Amino acid sequence: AGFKPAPPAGQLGAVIVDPYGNAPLTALVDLDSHVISDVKVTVHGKGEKGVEISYPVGQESLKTYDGVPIFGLYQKFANKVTVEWKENGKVMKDDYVVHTSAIVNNYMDNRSISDLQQTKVIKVAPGFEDRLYLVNTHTFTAQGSDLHWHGEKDKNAGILDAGPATGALPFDIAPFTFIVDTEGEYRWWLDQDTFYDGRDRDINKRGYLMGIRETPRGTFTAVQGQHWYEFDMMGQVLEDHKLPRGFADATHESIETPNGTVLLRVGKSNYRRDDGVHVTTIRDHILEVDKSGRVVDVWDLTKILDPKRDALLGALDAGAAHAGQQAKLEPDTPFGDALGVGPGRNWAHVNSIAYDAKDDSIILSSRHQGVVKIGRDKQVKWILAPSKGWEKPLASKLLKPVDANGKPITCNENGLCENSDFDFTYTQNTAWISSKGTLTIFDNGDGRHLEQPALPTMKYSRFVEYKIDEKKGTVQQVWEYGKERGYDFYSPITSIIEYQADRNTMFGFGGSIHLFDVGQPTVGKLNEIDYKTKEVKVEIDVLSDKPNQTHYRALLVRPQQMFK
Amino acid sequence: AGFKPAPPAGQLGAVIVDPYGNAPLTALVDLDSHVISDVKVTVHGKGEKGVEISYPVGQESLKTYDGVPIFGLYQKFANKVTVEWKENGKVMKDDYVVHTSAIVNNYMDNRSISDLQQTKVIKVAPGFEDRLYLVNTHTFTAQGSDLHWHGEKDKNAGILDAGPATGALPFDIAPFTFIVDTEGEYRWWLDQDTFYDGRDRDINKRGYLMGIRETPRGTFTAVQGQHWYEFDMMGQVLEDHKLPRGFADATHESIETPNGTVLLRVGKSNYRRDDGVHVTTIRDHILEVDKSGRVVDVWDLTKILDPKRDALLGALDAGAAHAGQQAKLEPDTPFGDALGVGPGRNWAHVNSIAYDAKDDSIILSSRHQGVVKIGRDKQVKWILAPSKGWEKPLASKLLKPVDANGKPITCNENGLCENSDFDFTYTQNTAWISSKGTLTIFDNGDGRHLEQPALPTMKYSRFVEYKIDEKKGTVQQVWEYGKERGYDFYSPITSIIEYQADRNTMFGFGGSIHLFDVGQPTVGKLNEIDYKTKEVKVEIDVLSDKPNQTHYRALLVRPQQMFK
């Protein structure tokens, strides 16, 4: 006879590239039974302007990998890596040359501009050269949507007709998952085969990889189709769970709480409507699950919010061939992933979740309705939304806009406010709690003021921050950005913002800029915006490898947290 | 075209047999979107003396299964099941007739006595008719051990010689996993394919299913080969984790702690010995892993205990063709799962773990060395063992035997005590912490008093309980049973006991009675012994489906805890 294992490279063990097989720009320095501590790793910049990547490695990590994890390598390169540690009280160091292979895009066709997604560095202020951004994007499969859930025949179907479809199985696309530095280089790749297989028909490996969120361990949760996962930066899949049997189509978000549970956004399969028809619902259930994959709690939004409220739905753009076209709801829209009222249609499209630990509640962004807080008791605590369409008793829960001095702000029922910078959010994403104790939201802005505008390019997106007084039931807009940047900063879908306390910036990713520009790449724009001065500290653009292909989100990742 | 799903059976949804596909004697009543509470299930006894199984079902369970779990069916039977609940304030009830299929043993050959293991009820005292016992046993594959880990060629191997084997991969056998009632009927079966596949050569489905232990959630953990698992009584696999890459060959035990971690017993692969030879060590490492499968801590026993101590090793029986044969240690014993001293041989054979929450330490049973407490700090706190062979400093940690009044008991270095019932344990199993605050042990008794006896049949096993004073470093024997039952109660290997506070009994399972009776089935004896009077409350024998085929363990299971 057989073949020897790799020999030791320096004063520890061998240096293994991509030990778990899912992360080709990582490596691992095998411990070979050495006992070490104070470990630190440095991956040197490539060329004169190369960004250096450096981090401490904790004991738990050394133990879990049986080795020193090496993160931050460049593809197809002779990476120069330094590892420093302590052993037998003595300070130790090795230098390695870690050759890597190439990043592969397994999903290409005649639409492909090239294999990888292009980056363009636009601005990097001094003090921000070190920043790393994980981009959660995707690439079309050659076949497109090839599978549907089978539904139940409705009262007025043809006698001869085959059964209809239900739910959202066709929301399925190959992942394109990478970390970019401030020189625009890929410094980490998640192999597309890690979770996905678009050529096989195993639904276990299908869906839309989304909701990449950090855990308290420096690892990450994600969802894809009918599973939810945890993985780490060495490409180790730490958890892979089937959704509990009652549920399906997990998309948009997963977030681990401080109680060791995970919040997910699913639909309910075999949901019995009042007319006795069974459907798979769309984006309108929330699960809390444990690490055993068991259900700790469920929020059925069809009994908490109002699936008949069409105030926003009726004001939406078709495109997100048919753009500018204000959505015309039909009472006979077949159940499915289709804009419409009622359980079985896309009436809510919930797309973010935040856990409020202070009172054991959840804050939801419903793209088609608003932002809402719902208690552990399944009651609505407040709503942030234009007042149109809300019946009693939910109307009583609408938050009242106010200025810095607390004085009511006048707004009409469509959300248009008088003599104020205050605006509500429309088709928003990522309603999250910031480290400052405030609510941050990416206000996409489709159907702004509950209508389409005169011309399509009359659309804008905002980063926005609110301060909420639950006791008084008032909301204050305390920070915004992007309304001036027009259509070149307009992300009709997806996207994210998050406040960064370390450098006092608002991090942002607009995921679908120029989505409608037929035949052009779609632009994902990573920003850091100085919170005090609104100065652009970072701006990096990522362009889709195929035209008119949305990006989903990005995260600002910190290597010093990755390997506790 | 298509086909409709099963229609609703009564006032909820359909009743699905073996919904997860791993547990043929379970069923599920689909909720079909009904909201219910106060759920209770009753499976009626078969015939006149049939045992009824009854249990409440918690909200978590209803949510996780999307239905009412039905546990405790008989095979190939028209089971009569009642389900009661509350809905819209109104008390509700259905009766169902739940047909089941047969239990299948997929591992049979010319040694098979018949397809299933035979049960023989020997004694059931009044008030114990309801007891259920999960039997963790196994059945030989037709090929036997077919795989080895590849090792490192040693200093003095032949020049032409192929590389040697290492570790314990051949420790591999098909599982036979069921619940028996007091009429000796099978009331649950875990499909052998759930974890095992002996006809394929995928090592992910190989090993020896063991260490089945209840969790705080009423589910169970287990180990097999290179994986560890959590499953529930509906046959759902809730977790499936690969061992961390530095480790292999998980056996004997797995226990979840109150901190949400799990203790496992493994060996270390590519363990570098002092002479520089790499081996996979055998049964001499403890991991604490989290539910992400990451290592939280490790105990390397080769640096904490003494792998050169042959006091007990040299006194052991071969058989466990060659029995009565006292073990003759050789200095040239090739590395492997072989009696021997040093890392890479089976010098310790650790077979149980208990967590001590009061001081964050672990208590281990080393078959070949004794019982030991090891602290979080990786130092030995105490040792319960005959004094022969222990060097300083470990000798100062031996516990000193004492009587009820606290006076020293005189024992020689082989453990034989003078004018006392007190004895140590030899080749013991399951050193666990009882609800009373004492240490319970199954004292198998091979190599008792560090020798073989005059005749093979002069061997006995005991259930034994100790009270330990860590401060004084004293140990007291406070209870025992079985020494008077002779050879028909002798289990040279495996086995377990556990104190049961509910009915004040000592539960026991002797796994290997008559192992050496060539050509006869091996007996596994389930016992509940009254703690006060030593009266046999329950005695049920299970006979192996092939001759000379040991059982492992059994657990007393409680349906009222299964479905929180």
Ligand SMILES: O=[N+]([O-])c1ccc(OS(=O)(=O)O)cc1
């Ligand atoms: O077509 N998409 O890729 C798409 C559409 C909507 C969408 O929902 S959202 O909340 O992210 O806007 C996500 C992805």
Ligand SMILES: O=[N+]([O-])c1ccc(OS(=O)(=O)O)cc1
């Ligand atoms: O031979 N066996 O299958 C076997 C032998 C020893 C053994 O170890 S013990 O700790 O469980 O006695 C387990 C199984």
